[PDB]
Amino acid sequence: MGSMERASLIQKAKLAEQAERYEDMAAFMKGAVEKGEELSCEERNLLSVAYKNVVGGQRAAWRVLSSIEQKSNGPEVREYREKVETELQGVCDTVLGLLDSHLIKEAGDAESRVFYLKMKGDYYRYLAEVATGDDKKRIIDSARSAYQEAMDISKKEMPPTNPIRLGLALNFSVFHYEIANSPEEAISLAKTTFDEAMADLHTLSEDSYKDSTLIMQLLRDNLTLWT
Amino acid sequence: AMGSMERASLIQKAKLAEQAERYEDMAAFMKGAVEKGEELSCEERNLLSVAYKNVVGGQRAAWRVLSSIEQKSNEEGSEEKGPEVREYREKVETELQGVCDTVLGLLDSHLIKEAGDAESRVFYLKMKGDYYRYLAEVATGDDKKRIIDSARSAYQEAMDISKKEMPPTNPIRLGLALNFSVFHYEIANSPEEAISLAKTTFDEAMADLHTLSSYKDSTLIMQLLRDNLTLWT
Amino acid sequence: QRSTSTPNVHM
Amino acid sequence: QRSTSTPNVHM
Ligand SMILES: *CC(=O)NCC1CCN(S(=O)(=O)c2ccc(I)cc2)CC1
Ligand SMILES: [Ca+2]
Ligand SMILES: [Ca+2]
Ligand SMILES: [Ca+2]
Ligand SMILES: [Mg+2]
Numbered sequence: 001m002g003s004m005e006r007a008s009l010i011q012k013a014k015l016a017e018q019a020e021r022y023e024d025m026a027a028f029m030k031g032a033v034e035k036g037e038e039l040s041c042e043e044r045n046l047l048s049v050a051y052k053n054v055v056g057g058q059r060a061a062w063r064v065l066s067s068i069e070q071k072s073n074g075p076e077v078r079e080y081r082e083k084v085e086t087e088l089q090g091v092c093d094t095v096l097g098l099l100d101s102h103l104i105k106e107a108g109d110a111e112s113r114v115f116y117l118k119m120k121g122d123y124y125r126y127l128a129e130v131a132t133g134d135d136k137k138r139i140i141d142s143a144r145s146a147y148q149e150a151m152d153i154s155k156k157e158m159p160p161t162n163p164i165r166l167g168l169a170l171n172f173s174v175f176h177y178e179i180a181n182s183p184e185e186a187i188s189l190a191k192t193t194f195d196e197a198m199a200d201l202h203t204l205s206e207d208s209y210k211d212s213t214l215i216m217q218l219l220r221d222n223l224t225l226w227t
Numbered sequence: 228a229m230g231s232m233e234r235a236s237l238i239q240k241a242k243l244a245e246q247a248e249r250y251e252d253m254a255a256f257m258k259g260a261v262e263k264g265e266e267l268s269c270e271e272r273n274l275l276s277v278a279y280k281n282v283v284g285g286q287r288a289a290w291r292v293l294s295s296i297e298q299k300s301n302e303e304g305s306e307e308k309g310p311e312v313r314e315y316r317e318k319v320e321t322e323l324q325g326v327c328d329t330v331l332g333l334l335d336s337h338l339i340k341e342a343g344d345a346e347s348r349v350f351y352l353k354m355k356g357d358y359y360r361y362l363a364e365v366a367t368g369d370d371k372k373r374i375i376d377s378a379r380s381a382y383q384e385a386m387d388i389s390k391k392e393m394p395p396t397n398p399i400r401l402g403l404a405l406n407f408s409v410f411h412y413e414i415a416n417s418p419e420e421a422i423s424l425a426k427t428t429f430d431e432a433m434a435d436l437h438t439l440s441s442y443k444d445s446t447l448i449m450q451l452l453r454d455n456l457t458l459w460t
Numbered sequence: 461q462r463s464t465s466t467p468n469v470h471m
Numbered sequence: 472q473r474s475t476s477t478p479n480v481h482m
Contacts, residue, residue, distance in 0.1 A: 011311045015296065019289035019319070045481045052479040061247035068243065076239045084247070122476075167477040174474045186474075211482050218475050225472060273470045280468040357465075402466035409463045421463075444471055451464045458463065 001031025009035070013046050022053035030094070033102050044115055051095050055126055058088040062130060085130050092123045099123075110157035111164055117150035118168040121175065128179050140179060147172045160196040161204040166215035169193040173219070177226060187226050194219045229259030237263075241274050250281035258329065261337050272350060279330050283361055286323040290365060293319055320365050327358045334358075345392035346399055352385035353403040356410065363414050375414060382407040395431040396439060401448040404428040408452070412459060422459050425452045 001009060009032040016025035029047045033039065039047060065081040104116045124143035131139050151172060154165040169189060177186035197216055204212055229237060237260040244253035257275045261267070267275065293316035300309045334355050342348040359378035366374045386407060389400040404424060412421035429452040432445060439445060 008311050012315050015293065015312055015315050018296065019292045019315075020285075021289050021319070024315075024318075049479060049481060056479060057248075061249050064247045065243065068246070074236070074239075076236050077243060080240050080243050080252075083252075084249070163482055167482075171476050174476045177474050215477065218477070222474050225474065277468060277470065284468060398471050402471075406465050409465045412463050448466065451466070455463050 001027065002034065004031065006032055006035040006037065010043065010046070013050065017046065017049065022050050022057075026050035026054050030098060033098055036102070038108065038112070039103070041111070044112070048115075048119070051091070055088065055091050055095075055123075058084060058091060059126060059129065062088055088130060089127060092127050095123045096120065110153055111162075114150045114154050114158065114164055114168060117146050117153070118164070118171060121147035121150065121168075122171055125171075125175055125179055143175060143179065147175060159203060160193075160200045161198075161208070161212050163208050163211040163215060166193065166197060166212055166219075170215055170218055170222075173222065177222075183226060187223065190219045190223050190226075194223070229255075229262065232259060234260055234263045234265065238271065238274070241278065245274065245277065250278055250285075254278035254282050258333060261333050264337065264341075266341055266343060267338070267347070272347070276354065279326065283323065283326050283330075283358075286319060286326065287361060287364065290316065290319050290323060323365060324362060327362050330358045331355065345388055346397070349385050349389045349393065349403060350399050352381050352388070353399070353406060356382035356385060356403075357406055360406070360410055360414060378410060379415065382410060394435060395428075396435045396441070396445045398441075398444040398448060401428065401432060401445060401452075405448055405451055405455075408455060412455070418459060422456065425456050425459075428452055429456070 004012070009028050013025050013028035013032065016022070016028060025046070029043070029050050032043065033047070061084050062081065065077060065084055069077045069081055099116055099120050104113070104120065121143050124139055124146060128136060128139045128143055147168070150168050154162070154168055158165045170193070173186045173190040173193070176182040176189065194216055197212065201212070237256045241253050241256035241260065244250070244256060253274070257271070257278050260271065261275065293312060297309070297312045297316050300312055334351055339348065339351045339355065342351055356378050359374055359381060363371060363374045363378055382403070385403050389397075389403060393400045395401075405428070408421045408425040408428070411417040411424060429449055432449050436442065436445070
């Protein structure tokens, strides 16, 4: 990747996206990140979409395999679940590595800092879904810490209906419910987020309306599911 | 290192990979099972076919998207764009070619020679025609001509056996004829032969439908013959 | 627009 | 039914 010009890497990521070749898309965006320039909002979208498609496929496969393994309770299903698990962990480690080495900085606008900290929380959460024992505790603490820092910035620097702030709060509420065994906190965070977002929706730009209303619908649907 | 793995373990892992929608893994497991050097069962032929066709099918869809972008860019003819899409189309094409070469290698090294009945030999020769057809779609120039001839030769040998050895409603025979008709129309620029083959296949199959259990599978391929005939009319 | 070939399903 | 997280769409 390093031999290609930054603009060429970005163009190839967009081509890979059109071709539904998400592993390639992710590798192109990793190369682009490694050039050492900040990412624009469009480029953060490319980065996010690419890696989430890859890890999404892995998570779906791991869930199928883990279900079969539990129902079974020969060696094959355990071996193959371990293989997929190790690949998932590899991808999460690559993303977390990029975030730590290049993307997360004290400098830069609030949107970008919150986006990257949310991403760190998400990828630790995906590691937590497959972890056991003492490692699991450390991983959960890492996710919680990243999400909390992002929440603190978003509350200080972004309006309550901002779609990045909303997506962060949605994902943190999922962390509480599905990872941290904290249903009360999940529900409380989702309800407070929903209400404060609706109270300020009249101030939101038209460019953000579809996105923010999508996230608020998801908060509502989770609230219905959890109650 | 699958050489030392139990055949039964490779087959079980191929079925696991299928349930997990992990088709590259599924195909690698089936390659390992083929390499054990025993004949395949009907279920194993289904696993092999489904795995490799998912892999190559995804590559073919990607190549089609990229080729269209490339052509559109080139036609506009701007002084400044086109190199990236060409290079990435070449990358996908190379990967596609590699998968097709792997399948053709398995057919040649293990499967065709070792088949012990007409039905399975016809299946494998059809598969050989299909993977040369997929190579033909991305080939250019003189290479293209050789590849087209290789596909034609495999399909014709399969057709020769199937007519002598299998009923006209057999789903392997039907799928072979369907695919050979597509070869004629889309690859060899022979619409007359495409239409002739599709019509004969459909009609001969229809005459024997009253005998079938099997009916679902046969009638599905027959419908696709009919759809192609309507399209080519 | 493209002709249909045999589907990728278990027979 | 698992909880739904932020969807993988361009924002
Ligand atoms: C302006 C900018 O940084 N844009 C990039 C997007 C920011 C938000 N993320 S997200 O994963 O937090 C997200 C929020 C809302 C929705 I609808 C989808 C994703 C994606 C990159
Ligand atoms: Ca309820
Ligand atoms: Ca070429
Ligand atoms: Ca016979
Ligand atoms: Mg493990």
